[PDB]
């Protein structure tokens, strides 16, 4: 989802359903690749 | 078991003593609730 | 008005700056609930 070659236009925004796996959000939060990383209703550090 | 611990089952935090219960959970039921609508009895995420 | 009725969920989901706001909402509500209960009990105990 992050590294896909193309992203769909917002009017036809793509949706991917992530399930039945183990998610490591630390690699997402420590990376300086994102200009806007705002978690709403939850804290980014607490995600692990 | 039978020890006051800080337990965390699937993100369900709490503090209490975990004892082998005789509740008749159906195969789909995860955890029980009391009248106070608080966690009362659980299923171990690794063992049914 | 808080994100969850359970204190432990808010604590395990939010950083202290926002957990403070949510817990303040819950504290206000629950303290008003005790105030109501104690006032009713005082009136009822006078009747008794
Ligand atoms: C993994 O969990 C399953 C639950 O269905 C259990 O049967 C199995 O013994 C567990 N294996 C390990 C290595 O924890």
From Swiss-Prot, chain B:
Recorded superkingdom: Viruses
Complexes and interactors: Binds to host ACE2. RBD also interacts with the N-linked glycan on 'Asn-90' of ACE2. Cleavage of S generates a polybasic C-terminal sequence on S1 that binds to host Neuropilin-1 (NRP1) and Neuropilin-2 (NRP2) receptors. Interacts with host integrin alpha-5/beta-1 (ITGA5:ITGB1) and with ACE2 in complex with integrin alpha-5/beta-1 (ITGA5:ITGB1). May interact via cytoplasmic c-terminus with M protein. May interact (via N-terminus) with host bilirubin and biliverdin, thereby preventing antibody binding to the SARS-CoV-2 spike NTD via an allosteric mechanism.
Function of the molecule: Attaches the virion to the cell membrane by interacting with host receptor, initiating the infection. The major receptor is host ACE2. When S2/S2' has been cleaved, binding to the receptor triggers direct fusion at the cell membrane. When S2/S2' has not been cleaved, binding to the receptor results in internalization of the virus by endocytosis using host TFRC and GRM2 and leading to fusion of the virion membrane with the host endosomal membrane. Alternatively, may use NRP1/NRP2 and integrin as entry receptors.
Protein name according to UniProt: Spike protein S1
Species the sequence originates in: Severe acute respiratory syndrome coronavirus 2
Gene from which the chain derives: S
Range within the parent protein: 535 to 582 of 1273
């Amino acid at each position: 989802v992050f590294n896909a070659t193309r992203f769909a236009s917002v009017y036809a925004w793509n949706r991917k359903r992530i399930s039945n796996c183990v998610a490591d959000y630390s690699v997402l939060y420590n990376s300086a690749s994102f200009s806007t990383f705002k978690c709403y209703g939850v804290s980014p550090t607490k995600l692990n | 078991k039978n020890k006051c611990v800080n337990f965390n089952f699937n993100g369900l935090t709490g503090t209490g003593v975990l004892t082998e219960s005789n509740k008749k959970f159906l195969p789909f039921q995860q955890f029980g609730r009391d009248i106070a609508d608080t966690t009362d009895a659980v299923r171990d995420p690794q063992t049914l | 008005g808080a994100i969850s009725s359970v204190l432990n969920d808010i604590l395990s989901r939010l950083d202290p700056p926002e957990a403070e706001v949510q817990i303040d909402r819950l504290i206000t509500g629950r303290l008003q609930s005790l105030q109501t209960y104690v006032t009713q009990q005082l009136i009822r105990a006078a009747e008794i």
